[PDB]
Amino acid sequence: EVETFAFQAEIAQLMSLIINTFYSNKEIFLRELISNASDALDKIRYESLTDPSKLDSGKELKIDIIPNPQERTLTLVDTGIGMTKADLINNLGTIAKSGTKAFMEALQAGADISMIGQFGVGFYSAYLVAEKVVVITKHNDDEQYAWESSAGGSFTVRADHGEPIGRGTKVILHLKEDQTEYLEERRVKEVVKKHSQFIGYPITLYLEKEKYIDQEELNKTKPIWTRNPDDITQEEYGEFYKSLTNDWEDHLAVKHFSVEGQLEFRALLFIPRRAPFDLFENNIKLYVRRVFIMDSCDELIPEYLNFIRGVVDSEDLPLNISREMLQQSKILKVIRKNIVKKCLELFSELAEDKENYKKFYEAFSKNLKLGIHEDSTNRRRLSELLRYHTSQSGDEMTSLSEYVSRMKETQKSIYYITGESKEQVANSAFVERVRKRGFEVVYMTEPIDEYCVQQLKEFDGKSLVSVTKEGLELPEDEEEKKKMEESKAKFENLCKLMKEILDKKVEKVTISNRLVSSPCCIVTSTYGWTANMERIMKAQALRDNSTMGYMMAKKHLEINPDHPIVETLRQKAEADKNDKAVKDLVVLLFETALLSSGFSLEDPQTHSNRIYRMIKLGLGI
Amino acid sequence: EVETFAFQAEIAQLMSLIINTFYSNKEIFLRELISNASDALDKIRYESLTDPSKLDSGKELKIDIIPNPQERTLTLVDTGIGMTKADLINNLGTIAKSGTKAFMEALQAGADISMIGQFGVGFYSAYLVAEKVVVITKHNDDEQYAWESSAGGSFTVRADHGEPIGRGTKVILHLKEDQTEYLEERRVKEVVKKHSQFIGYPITLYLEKEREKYIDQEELNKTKPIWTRNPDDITQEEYGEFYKSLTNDWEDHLAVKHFSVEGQLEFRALLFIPRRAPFDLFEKNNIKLYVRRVFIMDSCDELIPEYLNFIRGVVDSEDLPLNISREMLQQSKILKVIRKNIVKKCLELFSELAEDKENYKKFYEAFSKNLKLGIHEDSTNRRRLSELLRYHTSQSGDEMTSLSEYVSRMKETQKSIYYITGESKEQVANSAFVERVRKRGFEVVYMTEPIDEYCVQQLKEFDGKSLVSVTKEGLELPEDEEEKKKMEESKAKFENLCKLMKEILDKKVEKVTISNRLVSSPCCIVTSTYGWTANMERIMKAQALRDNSTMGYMMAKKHLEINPDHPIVETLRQKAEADKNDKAVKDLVVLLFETALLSSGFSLEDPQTHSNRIYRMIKLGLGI
Ligand SMILES: Nc1ncnc2c1ncn2[C@@H]1O[C@H](COP(=O)(O)OP(=O)(O)NP(=O)(O)O)[C@@H](O)[C@H]1O
Ligand SMILES: Nc1ncnc2c1ncn2[C@@H]1O[C@H](COP(=O)(O)OP(=O)(O)NP(=O)(O)O)[C@@H](O)[C@H]1O
Ligand SMILES: [Mg+2]
Ligand SMILES: [Mg+2]
């Protein structure tokens, strides 16, 4: 009844699939060949550990690239283990059969090798470019053989009897007409640097330049992340960073770590000394067994840490058939979690070095505050890295932890004020009273600060209070409260008169507890956008205008009872309930308060015209 | 001497390779199986054309998806052509052997068939989820067979004697415990909608529910792909229905561009302009690529420019170099050609829509930001995008006019397009800079949005006429001989006052002089020729991510321009001649400069100083 069968494969169609569909970019053939060559070396090197006599054929392990435009041939020579005739038929001649994996599983216990080859289809990627491939191999055991093929479903193995190759393999690709750009020095150098830059063995490119053969070592920067982090000095770290980033300045700080368990990977991160000019408009590169896999973009690192330049190297990771992406995206999330944790730890330990942390903060404070805006899980740890200019700080910047340390015994919040400049904020009207009482105020004078404090609601159990927002309530004395209530009862009449005069401009006009020298100030409502925040949002190039009015706040006017102007205005308003002079005066006062508070003016020409008219009245016109 | 050989393939490792390495996301197995079913149907339908009697076994072409969580089996049934025992052994058994490809190539002439299958490795993707796959087939010629395997390098073919199927193939996936999420109704619906939405034949999801344990049938591909139809025959109601089904918006499509491109790269595209603007427009699946009515990839800016991402629609192709996983292409030049054609047809669509005045008003009000972003970025398509611009001008009124109309009404002697940028229409219209120009009857373009600065950074001229910012220095209107004589006389007279004001406001204004752009305001602050305009500086001084040092590289060199015909300026000149220095004249000059700085759009370096000066002036005025 039941008739069992066995799976088969269409060799011609399978070869066509490998040639045409597996690999998107045709330049990766080098990446494969060198990889195979690397493995060819690794094997023999391993066999040299317990038997040095196996290296008598050749004492040197190297890789050579020889472009010959005369015959349009790209040659890749390696002094590796080489392949026997049986190895030629079984390994090269069989698709999906890798000799490297078979060698790897035949190792005793846990050895020190880790070879790239896993799938068995890497070699045929050479036919992405070549129209014919000739592999001249010479193993230590049997004689030198030649393997010729053109991906036509058949290949020929022949005794070579050519010039001896010592030990190893020489792969000659007869490039097709279209893909002749790989004979150029520039293309070969670029490809090798992009893909197989960190191969352990020296890769030498031969060329012809009177007329002599010139040799150039394509890879010279040894991958230092493999070495133990404790052994590496700072000079080696700087050299590696400079070679990696083409930067004359060395690194500012370096975090070299390793994660072991079900997911083993070691990473090396660098903080640049300065910030890139272009910046926001390649940061982290993922390596598997020391060969390039993919370039990180929002996967390994968040957007706000895109200034970190580094490498991630893993011995075992699921890989695409094309060896340029991973199979499981969850692994990328795990890598990101570990990298972010180690980066925050690096920043925290860097905060001890005062001058270095000053440089780092001056460079990447915008990134830190962007992370506070975005990374909700790391807000509590990122906030401790914030440095701000305060009233008690002076020229230097102090952290919020220092603020809490110096915070008065009865103070219950951290008072902050935002503006477009440090001078405007320092001389601003809102902080006039608080500084009189001795409470430290935090100046935040960058556009990213508004985004930072949209999310950073509190810190160290102390809430942030905006001085320029309504409902500010400093601790009060009983006498101060009595005076405030009496002044409110006295000035309610002028307040309602001003409210009547300033219709649809100010929702509420009240006396203020935050003014000591300025006559009046315009203060944003509780939930709406602050003046500075409204200025920032109004200037965004790509943002909906029709929605702005939903988030725009309602202005509140606050008058100072002790300022002479307000008292005189109150007396005039009581004496004359309606008058042209008082109306003009209150309109001008509101205009000045609007200008000083931070708000833009709906028609500044009107205010300027009023000033010009009063100037004319001053000098006579 | 020379010993030829033949290539081989290690079958077990090859199968493991297909299962583990080809496909990243495991949900695509349906995408493959459904596709096979589609092909299975196509063939039989073709064989009905020359032989209707061959459909006597079953007259219905359909696809059924039956999840059975009791046995953890996902069944996919199709009434397709079916496979013989020989086809079971060869087509299903042999990897990389596509019987569909053989059927396609054996077709004579060029037939309407365009079957999805091309590689021969699609079926084994079913082992991404299943631990054992059973395929019950019934070809129209031989008896019903059963093909069972577990990807262990061997499969068994058995003469089936269960419930007859009549015709077609029924594949049963015994899902592994980990991948049990595909027995859920929601997951199956989501996968089918994402991948196999536009398969020509109906797809039905049989299920068991209670309303007492009834069987519910639900079709998951009700929407049909209309882009295959000729664009002339389609009506606006059908286009609206397609847009609603594709985008899940109650609003209709604002406009539609449906076009086919033939040749060495043949593809049909269907683009829709949303009536409104998405809330997260600038905060990634607008254009979806299809090959033979199967979803391939989302246009992550490959098919469309970034500024044109507001446009929705589909791109469908028949012949296209496809990846092994069918989730991308092999050549990016194909994507570049696709993008070029899409952009050309989008610009043509916008030009056509510009005729419809009300519809173009809606479209512009929705996507003028995108148009100006394109002008900033897309350099090749600047003439058309510029011609698609509508602006508020001084002579326009409330309604908006194009720059071409501005040039049409442009005076005979005028030789430029005078524009002024600001943060509001009222502020710009009442601004001092345009006081003289409008007095002489020259139309001025109000540019009252932040993106306008980026738009005019690149758009240097239009129709051979150069754009000139009134707020920038060197503004030279066409001037007569007597006007130039008056300007020279004023330059002669106010030289001493200009020198005094330059001395007083040291390191704050580079140059103080007379001007021809003021008729009523005393003074104005004017940006230099090279640096950022005042509005530009205001805009990029408020960007969240900006380089402070770079801010200082392109700062404007402020120029003060006074009005010789303003009474304040003449009185100030008289006083400055009376006293080479005085406190009153210095205070007046500083206050005038501050007012000009405020009106010009420049933010004060310290508003507290100006406010305190005004407060002191008020105190003196009312008496303190
Ligand atoms: N230069 C070489 N020297 C020695 N052995 C080689 C060489 N090139 C290839 N081989 C062997 O031939 C096999 C076939 O090559 P290849 O297709 O690259 O397999 P693979 O590299 O192990 N699989 P992959 O992960 O894609 O690199 C290899 O696995 C090696 O065993
Ligand atoms: N439901 C079915 N009815 C009939 N034939 C089927 C069915 N499912 C699979 N086949 C056959 O299976 C063969 C190979 O399966 P498949 O893995 O889909 O290769 P394919 O058809 O080329 N699809 P693809 O690999 O994506 O190009 C096809 O040529 C069909 O003849
Ligand atoms: Mg290899
Ligand atoms: Mg298929």
Coordinates of N, CA and C and ligand atoms in Angstrom, one line a residue, chain A residues 17, chain B residues 23 31-33 35-41 43 76-78 80-83 87 90-94 96-102 116-125 135 137 168-171 324 326, ligand 2:
Chain A
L17 N 18.7 29.3 -9.0 CA 18.2 30.0 -7.8 C 19.3 30.6 -7.0
Chain B
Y23 N 13.2 32.3 4.9 CA 12.1 33.2 5.3 C 12.3 33.7 6.7
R31 N 0.7 32.7 2.6 CA 1.1 33.4 1.3 C 1.5 32.5 0.3
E32 N 2.3 31.5 0.6 CA 2.7 30.5 -0.3 C 1.6 29.5 -0.7
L33 N 1.0 28.9 0.3 CA 0.0 27.9 0.0 C -1.2 28.5 -0.8
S35 N -1.1 31.0 -2.7 CA -0.6 31.3 -4.1 C -0.6 30.0 -4.9
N36 N -0.1 28.9 -4.3 CA -0.2 27.6 -5.0 C -1.7 27.3 -5.4
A37 N -2.6 27.5 -4.4 CA -4.0 27.2 -4.7 C -4.4 28.1 -5.9
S38 N -4.0 29.4 -5.8 CA -4.4 30.3 -6.9 C -3.9 29.7 -8.3
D39 N -2.6 29.3 -8.3 CA -2.1 28.7 -9.5 C -2.9 27.4 -9.8
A40 N -3.1 26.6 -8.8 CA -3.9 25.3 -9.0 C -5.3 25.6 -9.7
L41 N -5.9 26.7 -9.3 CA -7.1 27.1 -9.9 C -6.9 27.6 -11.3
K43 N -4.8 27.1 -13.7 CA -4.7 26.0 -14.7 C -6.0 25.4 -15.0
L76 N -6.2 23.8 4.2 CA -6.4 24.7 3.0 C -6.8 23.9 1.8
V77 N -8.1 24.1 1.4 CA -8.7 23.3 0.4 C -8.9 24.2 -0.9
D78 N -8.6 23.6 -2.0 CA -8.8 24.3 -3.3 C -9.4 23.4 -4.3
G80 N -8.7 23.2 -7.4 CA -7.9 23.5 -8.5 C -7.7 22.3 -9.5
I81 N -6.6 22.3 -10.3 CA -6.4 21.3 -11.2 C -6.2 20.0 -10.6
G82 N -5.5 20.0 -9.4 CA -5.1 18.8 -8.7 C -3.8 18.2 -9.3
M83 N -3.3 17.2 -8.6 CA -2.0 16.6 -9.0 C -2.2 15.0 -9.1
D87 N 2.7 13.7 -10.7 CA 2.9 15.0 -10.3 C 3.2 15.1 -8.8
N90 N 6.9 14.1 -8.7 CA 7.9 15.0 -9.3 C 7.7 16.5 -8.8
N91 N 6.5 17.0 -8.9 CA 6.4 18.5 -8.6 C 6.5 18.7 -7.1
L92 N 5.8 18.0 -6.3 CA 5.8 18.2 -4.9 C 7.1 17.6 -4.3
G93 N 7.5 16.4 -4.8 CA 8.7 15.8 -4.2 C 10.0 16.4 -4.5
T94 N 10.2 16.9 -5.7 CA 11.5 17.4 -6.1 C 11.6 18.9 -5.8
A96 N 12.9 22.7 -5.9 CA 13.3 23.6 -7.0 C 12.7 23.2 -8.4
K97 N 11.8 22.2 -8.4 CA 11.1 21.8 -9.6 C 9.7 22.4 -9.5
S98 N 9.5 23.4 -10.4 CA 8.2 24.1 -10.5 C 7.4 23.5 -11.6
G99 N 6.4 22.7 -11.3 CA 5.4 22.3 -12.3 C 4.6 23.4 -12.9
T100 N 4.4 24.4 -12.1 CA 3.7 25.6 -12.6 C 4.5 26.3 -13.7
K101 N 5.8 26.4 -13.5 CA 6.7 27.0 -14.5 C 6.6 26.1 -15.8
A102 N 6.6 24.8 -15.7 CA 6.5 24.0 -16.9 C 5.1 24.2 -17.6
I116 N 1.6 32.7 -10.2 CA 2.5 33.3 -9.2 C 3.8 32.4 -9.2
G117 N 3.7 31.1 -9.2 CA 4.9 30.3 -8.9 C 6.0 30.4 -10.0
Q118 N 7.2 30.5 -9.5 CA 8.4 30.6 -10.4 C 9.6 29.8 -9.9
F119 N 9.7 29.5 -8.6 CA 11.0 29.0 -8.1 C 10.9 27.5 -8.0
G120 N 10.0 27.0 -7.2 CA 10.0 25.5 -6.8 C 10.3 25.2 -5.4
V121 N 10.4 26.2 -4.5 CA 10.6 26.0 -3.1 C 9.5 26.6 -2.2
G122 N 8.4 27.0 -2.8 CA 7.4 27.6 -2.0 C 6.7 26.7 -1.1
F123 N 6.4 25.5 -1.5 CA 5.6 24.6 -0.7 C 6.2 24.3 0.7
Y124 N 7.6 24.1 0.7 CA 8.3 23.7 1.9 C 8.3 24.8 2.9
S125 N 7.9 26.0 2.6 CA 7.7 27.0 3.6 C 6.6 26.7 4.5
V135 N -1.1 16.2 2.3 CA -1.7 16.8 1.1 C -2.6 15.8 0.4
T137 N -4.9 15.0 -2.7 CA -5.1 15.5 -4.0 C -6.0 14.6 -4.8
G168 N -9.3 18.8 -7.0 CA -8.6 19.8 -6.2 C -7.6 19.1 -5.3
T169 N -7.0 20.0 -4.4 CA -6.1 19.6 -3.4 C -6.4 20.1 -2.0
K170 N -6.3 19.3 -1.0 CA -6.5 19.7 0.4 C -5.2 19.5 1.2
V171 N -4.6 20.5 1.6 CA -3.4 20.5 2.4 C -3.7 20.6 3.9
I324 N 14.3 35.5 -3.3 CA 14.0 34.1 -3.0 C 12.9 34.0 -2.0
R326 N 10.6 36.4 -1.8 CA 9.5 37.1 -2.4 C 9.1 38.3 -1.5
Ligands
LIG2 N1 -2.9 22.9 -4.4 C1 -2.1 22.5 -5.4 N2 -2.7 22.0 -6.5 C2 -2.0 21.6 -7.5 N3 -0.7 21.6 -7.6 C3 -0.1 22.1 -6.5 C4 -0.7 22.5 -5.4 N4 0.2 22.9 -4.4 C5 1.3 22.7 -5.0 N5 1.3 22.2 -6.3 C6 2.3 21.8 -7.2 O1 3.6 22.0 -6.5 C7 4.6 22.5 -7.4 C8 5.7 23.2 -6.7 O2 5.1 23.8 -5.5 P1 5.7 25.2 -5.1 O3 6.6 25.0 -3.9 O4 4.6 26.2 -4.9 O5 6.5 25.6 -6.3 P2 6.0 26.8 -7.2 O6 4.6 26.4 -7.8 O7 6.9 27.2 -8.2 N6 5.7 28.1 -6.1 P3 7.1 29.1 -6.0 O8 8.2 28.2 -5.3 O9 6.7 30.2 -5.0 O10 7.5 29.6 -7.3 C9 3.8 23.4 -8.4 O11 4.4 23.4 -9.6 C10 2.4 22.7 -8.4 O12 2.3 21.8 -9.6

